[PDB]
Amino acid sequence: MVSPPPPIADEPLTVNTGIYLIECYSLDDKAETFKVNAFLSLSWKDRRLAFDPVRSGVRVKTYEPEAIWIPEIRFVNVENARDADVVDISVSPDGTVQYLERFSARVLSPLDFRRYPFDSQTLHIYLIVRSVDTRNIVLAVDLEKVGKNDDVFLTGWDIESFTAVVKPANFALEDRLESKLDYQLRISRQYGYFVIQTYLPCIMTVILSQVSFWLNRESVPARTVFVVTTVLTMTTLSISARNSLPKVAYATAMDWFIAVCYAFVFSALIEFATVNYFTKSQPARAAKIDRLSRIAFPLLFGIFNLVYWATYL
Amino acid sequence: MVSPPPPIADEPLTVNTGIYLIECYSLDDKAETFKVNAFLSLSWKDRRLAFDPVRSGVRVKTYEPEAIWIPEIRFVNVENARDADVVDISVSPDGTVQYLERFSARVLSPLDFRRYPFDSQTLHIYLIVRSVDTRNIVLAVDLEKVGKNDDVFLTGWDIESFTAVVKPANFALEDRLESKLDYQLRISRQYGYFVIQTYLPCIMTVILSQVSFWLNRESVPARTVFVVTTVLTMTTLSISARNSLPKVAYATAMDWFIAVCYAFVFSALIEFATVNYFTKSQPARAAKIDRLSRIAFPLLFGIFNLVYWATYL
Amino acid sequence: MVSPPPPIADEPLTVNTGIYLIECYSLDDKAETFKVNAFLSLSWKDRRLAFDPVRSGVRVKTYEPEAIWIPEIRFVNVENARDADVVDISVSPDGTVQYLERFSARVLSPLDFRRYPFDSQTLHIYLIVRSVDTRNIVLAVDLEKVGKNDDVFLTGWDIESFTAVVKPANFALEDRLESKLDYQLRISRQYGYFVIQTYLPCIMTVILSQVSFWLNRESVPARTVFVVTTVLTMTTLSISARNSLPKVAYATAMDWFIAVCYAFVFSALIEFATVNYFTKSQPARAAKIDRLSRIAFPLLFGIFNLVYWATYL
Amino acid sequence: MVSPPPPIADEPLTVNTGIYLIECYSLDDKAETFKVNAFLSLSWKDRRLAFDPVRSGVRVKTYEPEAIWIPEIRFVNVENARDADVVDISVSPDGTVQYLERFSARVLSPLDFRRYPFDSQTLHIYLIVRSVDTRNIVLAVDLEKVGKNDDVFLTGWDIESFTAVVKPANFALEDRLESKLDYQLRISRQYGYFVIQTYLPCIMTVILSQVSFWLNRESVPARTVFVVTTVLTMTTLSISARNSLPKVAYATAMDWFIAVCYAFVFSALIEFATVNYFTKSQPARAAKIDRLSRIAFPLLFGIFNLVYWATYL
Amino acid sequence: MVSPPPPIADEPLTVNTGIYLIECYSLDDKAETFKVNAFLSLSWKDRRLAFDPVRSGVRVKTYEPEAIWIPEIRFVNVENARDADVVDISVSPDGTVQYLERFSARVLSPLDFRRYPFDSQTLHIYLIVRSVDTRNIVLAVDLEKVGKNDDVFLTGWDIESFTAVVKPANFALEDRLESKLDYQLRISRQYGYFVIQTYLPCIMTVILSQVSFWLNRESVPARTVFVVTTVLTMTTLSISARNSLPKVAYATAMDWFIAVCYAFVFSALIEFATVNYFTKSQPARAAKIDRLSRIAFPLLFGIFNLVYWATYL
Numbered sequence A, B, C, D, E: 001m002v003s004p005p006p007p008i009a010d011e012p013l014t015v016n017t018g019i020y021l022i023e024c025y026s027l028d029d030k031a032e033t034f035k036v037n038a039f040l041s042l043s044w045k046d047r048r049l050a051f052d053p054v055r056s057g058v059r060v061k062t063y064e065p066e067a068i069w070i071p072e073i074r075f076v077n078v079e080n081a082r083d084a085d086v087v088d089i090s091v092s093p094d095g096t097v098q099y100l101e102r103f104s105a106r107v108l109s110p111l112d113f114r115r116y117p118f119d120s121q122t123l124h125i126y127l128i129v130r131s132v133d134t135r136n137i138v139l140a141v142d143l144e145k146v147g148k149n150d151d152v153f154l155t156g157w158d159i160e161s162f163t164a165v166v167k168p169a170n171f172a173l174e175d176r177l178e179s180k181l182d183y184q185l186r187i188s189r190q191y192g193y194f195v196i197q198t199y200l201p202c203i204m205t206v207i208l209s210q211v212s213f214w215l216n217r218e219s220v221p222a223r224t225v226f227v228v229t230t231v232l233t234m235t236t237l238s239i240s241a242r243n244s245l246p247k248v249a250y251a252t253a254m255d256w257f258i259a260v261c262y263a264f265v266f267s268a269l270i271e272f273a274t275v276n277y278f279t280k281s282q283p284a285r286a287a288k289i290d291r292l293s294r295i296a297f298p299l300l301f302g303i304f305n306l307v308y309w310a311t312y313l
């Protein structure tokens, strides 16, 4: 068929849209994608479908999608076209069509890892419709039809809210008007997992590097094992940790924590080398170095942790 | 076709549901998903299809899905719509339709890892139907049609039971009634694998750390190698072990066992450092520290293992 | 159409089945699945399709699948419904339908890892048919139509035979009679790969641990390096090896070999600790301990290897 | 239908093409593939579809793809045929068809890793059409119809431009004329990630190897630990780094940096072995070797880094 | 439709086949599969479709696949049925059909790793056609229609040739004649990648093991670190390397190189143990052992590399 002609002859047809989240899963940090399963509801007026509720013995009447004109509604930030099962189509005597489908889709939405793993994100789902030559078509948001099931979970996140920006973006694209709505799922990451995956190994590796200051300065190999293994451990943890993220250009909050831990451990190595350098000549100097280090290192590290955890929580 | 009109004019149409598990596989702890292949049986009354059992020499008669109205039944907590092959449709003389399909689906159901790897789970499969404008449709459970084949296996688990909650959850959603049933597969994990994957490496690594107390106090590098490699091994096992799980915030029972093992090993490091601190001056104190440690450590560790394994078995 | 009515009025229709393996691949030990690509041949009698071979100038005549009744044949132990292309349908003058399709499927079959990697398996392909309300349907095996192409290979396995159990298993399921056939692909694993993936690292790691008995007792750190690295290597090989298998409860033959190797290595550690414990006081005892160990350890290890490889080969 | 006959009887029909990038994701360096989601626009002349704009009260008129002849346009460097949803088909009074589809595809395009990770690439998308027996078909580029949305991102790259080579490549293939267009997405890699993934571990590992020159020459085990672990670390980092790339024959810029770092580290090992060789006999020589090394190594390494980072930036 | 009747009443219908490779990708050594995107061209004679070239003013005329009989051509060694888009079907006045499709497929073809990574392979694509009851059908090869695009690449390989074995294998299968063609893609591996992935780490690890002979015999821990870490490095490199291949029974050329390197490294270990054994008593003997070893080991290793690289290049 063709689109409903305008009664005002010059009026845009608006399609009232709503999304109801049923299932939300597979939030992939590295791919910056997530999978969503929801209701899509569309509503518009096609007076061609009007009918007498009495002559037609039905209060509503229901159609197959093949029977009537339906707006071509597409998702933008999706990998493939969604998979949809039309659920219901109900017309009113005045021509008001209420369309309901259930869809699943792989949404592509970029993440801001700067504050990671203390990050919040806005996942976006962009709806769009392209105007035909006979009529311009415009999207709108029916707030009654937006929401999400209570049993919606992302197994590592707190889900804040699912809302829609009511005023759409209308613009020209290849000589036709396109109309775009922005559905926004706000989430904030649950960082605790990482505390025992990365932060604790880091803190313990720093402490372990500091244990070397209490070993006798003459047992040089022992202190060597301490200093060297803690340096290699920091390097391994650093690489491992950045392996969870996409190849982002910037540095994360975890990056800063790991880099400072690497600073403390490598400084313990430099301290061991200096102390070893002054042990025969000027043993008083070496002894003073260890005496001060045993207090300074764990103090600067404690203060650092205070500023860090105070800041990012 | 169209939905069966009510005889009582105000009676909800109930559809009797049953699921019979044929194959159960791919229980993914990290994805919190599993795959199921089963019979779905639905049964309802459409008097329009009734017929005289004597005038018609046939006892049942069978239709194709296109011939008669069939209720649209959806799964809720699933990733894509199921793949189903209709098996049979048999109408009764009184108008009772018995529908049978075989379907496969990827179900998404969250797991409770707090007690892991000594955990039990309830996998859920939610059936749902949305009411039409002409009639409300309500789900119910035919126990004769619920079960699972005996040769059904989840390799890492014991399958306890497959049952259904008979009273459905009926509620309003986007201005129509939905009726939702909760099918429940109860399972409990087989922990033995993990005993030799993680628990043994941990217990042996704690013992290894304790061997250092019997080495000569003067051979500082040897004891250093013992202490340091056991600390790094504990960390490695911690990270490795948590890699099996989704990014849950909390701690598993395995987490507690590993954390206490880390406590014993790091305590062995602190002991080595203390003994080394007193080896030249006050060799009696250092010697006594080794003497007590050699009894306390394996004893406290044995007691801990006793309380832990007594608790979680 | 409808199912072929019985000539004896009470006789079950048997469907003669055959499978011809064309391609066999992706035998996944962890997933307990494999992929199969084969011919499925069915043959039954439908008198309605008989015809005069002389009046009709054709010796066979061929139908389209939509033209005639075809039995619904399903695989049981499969993940999704198979993918099939109907190849040919030939009716005989008497009504004998010979149906031929080519299908691919992902078969789900449990593996018995107890004797692994010296294990044999039976991969199963269960065919099944459900009786309709008009007639009971029963499966049988046409031996002429069972076999496999010679260039069928499972890269890690020797394929012994592909045969079928002629008598089917008939049983009641949800108030109808079902008929189930068991096609059996027998395979036996080629263990050589594992000899150089796991068995050699283990044997050499044990030997390496035994070299420590020949090092000077006064050079404590050297012997520490030997003993400790060999223990951690054994643990690493153990975890690595068990990562190839599903989360089975039991122990494999490889588990036993690795565990005994771990016994030898940890025993060498305990020996080094005893010798070190007796080195200052009672150097004769320490020396005697090493003297005996250098003969006992590699001797008991050789004997063990003799029993092990004699048993599992 | 059939293809439009030529007005000149011997004139090729040109199809004006355009691509508008909507989504660009999953650029896999190892697979040398990327995924694209875009508009494909085609435009050509079919006089059979011309019409009087006055007798027909419509200014454009729109057809279904089944109604009119549409040119078969294929992508060359793609894995499967694209997935396309026809969006709009608009005929003009003169017979000018404006066709618009939205497609997703997995494009296969080779990468030049010689300058990696400081590399720029040209991803190619080849359009092609095969001439029919009735008429030759030739592709062209409608610049109005080429572009890309501003929010297009490759989460690891800077996107320079998306342009088309206007002149197509015409050639004979299996006795017919083919016409091929080259759409080119120019991108350049964001190397910063790799600086902290590989370049820093390498630089620090070289520095660590240099610390050994400041340890007392008599503490041979300590220096052994430094030298040996830094060499093995270089090897591990090399293997890890080359694991991100396809099995390319040549060497990348990163290969060179890692190889020079390996030169410096192995040179420190060779230095330690030489120093240890001369420590008893000719200790002045050994002392001088350390004296010069402490100045030369970090100087040659700093100079090298200066030349390298100056060159590849 | 039906198959073309024979003019000779007893003549087999031949189908002239050709494949033109467009895209060749994803050669998976472990899966022994590769993906191909190509033209499939078929050509046969159906007199029923003939026409007068003069009365009919048309030189060819074109049909839709539904209009005429088309032979069912299947690939044998493929995982799923191919995905094909029919491109063109052109009949000649005499009745010669020229059919052209573009298909993609996942081909399964076994590899011979004995000479790896210096291996050449023949990837096979088997075409096959099954005879119908009315006529025997036989495959043949049209060389004009066989080839590959010049920009066809398998990263990590040299593509030698794509040819066909002209004489097909005709044989009986389940009581009908099948006709099978062997298309052969010859390739040879580019080993250079492996040179820097495995061969260099091995060679340098052997050299590193030899450095121990130049360290002072009294620094037992130092030599212990050398010998032990190099032995474990060899084991790790071995396991890593074999992880790239399927679970083949035999040994590759790379296996032999790695095994000889392990021999040299373990022999250096045995030498260190022997030298350490004779260091107190008979220092002349130990000294002589190091003196000879420092020349023999690197010499025998140089000769070995000479024979090996001379052989496999």
Ligand SMILES: CC(C)CCC[C@@H](C)[C@H]1CC[C@H]2[C@@H]3CC=C4C[C@@H](OC(=O)CCC(=O)O)CC[C@]4(C)[C@H]3CC[C@]12C
Binding pocket: A238, A254, A255, A256, A258, A259, A262, A263, A266, A267, A270, D196, D200, D204
């Ligand atoms: C100039 C003389 C007198 C002193 C020579 C010693 C310096 C060369 C050392 C001392 C502290 C070292 C720094 C300690 C910490 C780091 C953090 C490290 O960053 C990371 O590891 C990033 C990890 C991540 O991003 O997750 C980079 C090297 C750097 C700057 C080191 C550079 C070399 C430094 C300056």
Ligand SMILES: CC(C)CCC[C@@H](C)[C@H]1CC[C@H]2[C@@H]3CC=C4C[C@@H](OC(=O)CCC(=O)O)CC[C@]4(C)[C@H]3CC[C@]12C
Binding pocket: A196, A200, A204, B238, B239, B242, B251, B254, B255, B256, B258, B259, B260, B262, B263, B264, B266, B267, B270
């Ligand atoms: C000055 C000397 C005398 C005492 C200083 C030593 C303390 C700082 C040590 C003693 C016990 C240690 C604790 C022992 C065990 C743990 C558990 C450990 O947790 C895990 O490894 C988690 C593993 C998992 O969850 O899988 C984190 C470090 C911690 C808190 C250690 C923190 C540092 C502690 C308090």
Ligand SMILES: CC(C)CCC[C@@H](C)[C@H]1CC[C@H]2[C@@H]3CC=C4C[C@@H](OC(=O)CCC(=O)O)CC[C@]4(C)[C@H]3CC[C@]12C
Binding pocket: B196, B200, B204, C238, C239, C242, C254, C255, C256, C258, C259, C260, C262, C263, C266, C267, C270
């Ligand atoms: C003689 C006294 C003074 C000191 C020894 C204390 C014992 C408690 C030690 C000595 C030998 C140890 C055993 C050495 C070998 C192993 C094999 C180990 O099994 C595995 O590693 C499983 C590997 C796999 O299954 O893949 C389990 C611990 C166990 C029994 C150890 C348990 C603790 C033992 C008995």
Ligand SMILES: CC(C)CCC[C@@H](C)[C@H]1CC[C@H]2[C@@H]3CC=C4C[C@@H](OC(=O)CCC(=O)O)CC[C@]4(C)[C@H]3CC[C@]12C
Binding pocket: D238, D242, D254, D255, D256, D258, D259, D260, D262, D263, D266, D270, E196, E200, E204
């Ligand atoms: C003269 C004697 C007394 C001692 C020196 C023996 C040589 C044989 C050493 C000195 C420098 C070494 C080279 C140092 C650096 C390299 C680059 C190295 O390349 C890499 O491993 C980088 C990894 C990558 O390419 O990604 C390969 C070994 C090699 C050629 C080494 C080969 C062995 C060499 C030539």
Ligand SMILES: CC(C)CCC[C@@H](C)[C@H]1CC[C@H]2[C@@H]3CC=C4C[C@@H](OC(=O)CCC(=O)O)CC[C@]4(C)[C@H]3CC[C@]12C
Binding pocket: C196, C200, C204, E238, E251, E254, E255, E256, E258, E259, E262, E263, E266, E267, E270
């Ligand atoms: C005091 C003297 C007589 C030595 C006594 C110890 C022997 C038992 C050692 C010395 C040399 C060793 C051999 C040195 C090298 C190897 C190669 C090794 O092969 C591999 O690692 C294969 C790796 C791969 O296939 O990739 C198998 C063990 C073996 C034969 C060793 C077996 C044990 C041997 C004979």
Ligand SMILES: CCCCCCCCCCCC
Binding pocket: A263, A264, A267, A288, A289, A292, A293, A296, A297, A300
């Ligand atoms: C994270 C940086 C640590 C810096 C610690 C400086 C300690 C100075 C000790 C000097 C002793 C003479």
Ligand SMILES: CCCCCCCCCCCC
Binding pocket: A195, A203, A301, A302, A305, A309
């Ligand atoms: C909310 C959990 C934070 C855990 C980290 C607390 C900071 C510990 C610092 C230890 C420094 C020695």
Ligand SMILES: CCCCCCCCCCCC
Binding pocket: B260, B263, B264, B267, B289, B292, B293, B296, B297, B300
């Ligand atoms: C869970 C915490 C375990 C810590 C063990 C402490 C042992 C102290 C022994 C004191 C002997 C001197």
Ligand SMILES: CCCCCCCCCCCC
Binding pocket: B195, B203, B301, B302, B305, B309
């Ligand atoms: C199936 C139960 C396995 C539990 C194993 C407990 C072993 C405790 C060892 C403690 C050694 C100190």
Ligand SMILES: CCCCCCCCCCCC
Binding pocket: C263, C264, C267, C288, C289, C292, C293, C296, C297, C300
């Ligand atoms: C795996 C069991 C090894 C047992 C070796 C016994 C050696 C006894 C040596 C003690 C002599 C006093």
Ligand SMILES: CCCCCCCCCCCC
Binding pocket: D260, D263, D264, D267, D289, D292, D293, D296, D297, D300
């Ligand atoms: C990349 C190669 C490093 C070469 C450094 C040589 C240093 C000179 C040592 C002088 C010894 C007396």
Ligand SMILES: CCCCCCCCCCCC
Binding pocket: E260, E263, E264, E267, E292, E293, E296, E297, E300
């Ligand atoms: C192919 C196996 C190589 C083994 C190398 C042994 C070299 C022996 C040298 C002994 C010198 C006394």
Ligand SMILES: CCCCCCCCCCCC
Binding pocket: E195, E203, E298, E301, E302, E305, E309
């Ligand atoms: C084609 C490149 C082959 C590389 C062979 C390197 C051989 C080095 C042997 C060194 C022996 C000491």
Ligand SMILES: [Cl-]
Binding pocket: A073, A074, A075, A078, A080, A081, A082
């Ligand atoms: Cl969509």
Ligand SMILES: [Cl-]
Binding pocket: A221, B221, C221, D221, E221
């Ligand atoms: Cl020492």
Ligand SMILES: [Cl-]
Binding pocket: B073, B074, B075, B078, B080, B081, B082
């Ligand atoms: Cl569903």
